[PDB]
Design a protein around this ligand. Structure first.
Ligand code: AZR
Length: 261
């Protein structure tokens, strides 16, 4: 079966809706499956918030070391790093690292608040040429992932294009691009998602997201040992609010689309 037939069969077995966009930077070719359909980003949206702060830091050499006070009232549903710093401070760089590498939701919220609200994250995406991304809410409500709800959504293709621009392309000046890549490569939350579908020795940077409706997402930049990078978005969502998340589906999709590379 072709790659498209394999992805359709994966979706058919999955009990949900699968969205895939792979960009092969060797030749700019693409593998697309529901890639123009909206999906709730869940915590994959954190890449855009962190990158928006990195953009600001290009013109403010003190920004990344700016102190942010962490209070008990800032804690939400999932904040393994920020809870260690209640009554102290974290820098904006430390908040970017925590948001991306541990998916700390308090850290995401501090990034959003620093920027001036969810709409400012949307404006940053637009400044990169991404007409599709929208951030509407803070964490954790941005992960409700209700079917057909446009809030906090993008498409697989839009996010793959923007992730390519952010990590390998024109979106950020070099020091800031490099910092984003360092953060993504050090992610701790993605072992069982895209990474599990790839050769163990390939270098990967990624950001996961999991929400209601069993919504299970991962966005990655992948560096093969002997080939140009691949940028891969795998989004997955299910019809029932309390569906289990399915990182195995993302690993399976990654294996299908990276075969031969
Ligand atoms: C982002 O996707 C974010 N997700 C959530 O905060 C929600 N659940 O996350 C945890 C890890 C708690 C889970 O048990 O799935 C969630 C479900 S419903 C809702 N309104 N929020 C997490 C923290 N990011 S991820 O990268 O770890 O998935």
């Amino acid at each position: 079966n072709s790659v498209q037939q394999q992805l359709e069969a994966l979706e058919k077995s999955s009990g949900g809706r699968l969205g895939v966009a792979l960009i092969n930077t060797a030749d700019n070719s693409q593998i697309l499956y529901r890639a123009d359909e909206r999906f709730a980003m869940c915590s994959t949206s954190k890449v855009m918030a962190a990158a928006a702060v990195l953009k600001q830091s290009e013109s403010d050499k003190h920004l990344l070391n700016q102190r942010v006070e962490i209070k008990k009232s800032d804690l939400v549903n999932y904040n393994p790093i920020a809870e260690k710093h209640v009554n102290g401070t974290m820098t904006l760089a430390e908040l970017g690292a925590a948001a991306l590498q541990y998916s700390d939701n308090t850290a995401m919220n501090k990034l959003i608040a620093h920027l001036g609200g969810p709409d400012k994250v949307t404006a940053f995406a637009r400044s990169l040429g991404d007409e599709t991304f929208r951030l509407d809410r803070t964490a954790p409500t941005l992960n409700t992932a209700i079917p057909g709800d446009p809030r906090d959504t993008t498409t697989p293709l839009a996010m793959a294009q923007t992730l390519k621009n952010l990590t390998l392309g024109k979106a950020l000046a070099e020091t800031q691009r490099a910092q984003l890549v360092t953060w993504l490569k050090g992610n701790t939350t993605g072992s069982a998602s895209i990474r599990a579908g790839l050769p163990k020795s390939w270098v990967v940077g990624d950001k996961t997201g999991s929400g209601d409706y069993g919504t299970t997402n991962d966005i990655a930049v992948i560096w093969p040992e002997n080939h140009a990078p691949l940028v891969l978005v795998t989004y997955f969502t299910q019809p029932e609010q309390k569906a289990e998340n399915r990182n195995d589906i993302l690993a399976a999709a990654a294996k299908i689309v990276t075969h031969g590379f």
